[PDB]
Design a protein around this ligand. Sequence first.
Ligand SMILES: CNC(=O)c1ccc(CNCc2ccc(-n3ccnc3)c(-c3cn(Cc4ccc(OC)cc4)nc3C)c2)cc1
Length: 183
Amino acid sequence: HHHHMVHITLDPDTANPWLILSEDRRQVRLGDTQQSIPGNEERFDSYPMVLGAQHFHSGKHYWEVDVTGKEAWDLGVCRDSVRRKGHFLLSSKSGFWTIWLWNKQKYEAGTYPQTPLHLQVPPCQVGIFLDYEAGMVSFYNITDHGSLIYSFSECAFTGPLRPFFSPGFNDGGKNTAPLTLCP
Ligand SMILES: CNC(=O)c1ccc(CNCc2ccc(-n3ccnc3)c(-c3cn(Cc4ccc(OC)cc4)nc3C)c2)cc1
């Protein structure tokens, strides 16, 4: 899978106005203040979400995302046609293929309804591999010699796909450090 690595970048036309992007486009975290920027159709107005720039309509692709220290997060890939505006469900049935950490140590998966996870080694880095023809997306624990964490399947896929991120709320003030796309 490592042999399908692709360069991903944060598209700032989607980013929630509370989110701070690095100047290299390799980092997202939540800023304590808001930002004045356009009201455009592509932006997530409610929830702290941002997309990858690159559209995929075929082939095998793979990236890695550091999450060292973080007490929550959401990683995945989604259809280009997903809603951006208002309140909704992270679910495969709504075209979101995702996993998350919430409540400090509670790992879970975007089935409807949602499927908890049982991991022996808490992941510090996470591999995401999409194979568009196969209709699959997969997720690996880098810290634990690359063990498989969960894998969507029989996905169909008809339109363009997008990498998908969220560094989580810091409701507690202890989830401040960012998602950093690693090499
Ligand atoms: C934020 N909190 C809630 O809204 C909430 C909503 C419902 C529940 C009820 N139990 C199911 C359950 C548990 C956990 C989660 N979750 C938490 C983090 N990621 C996923 C979800 C979930 C979340 N979304 C959308 C989303 C994702 C991230 C985000 O920013 C960080 C904002 C919006 N959709 C579902 C479905 C559902 C618990 C918490």
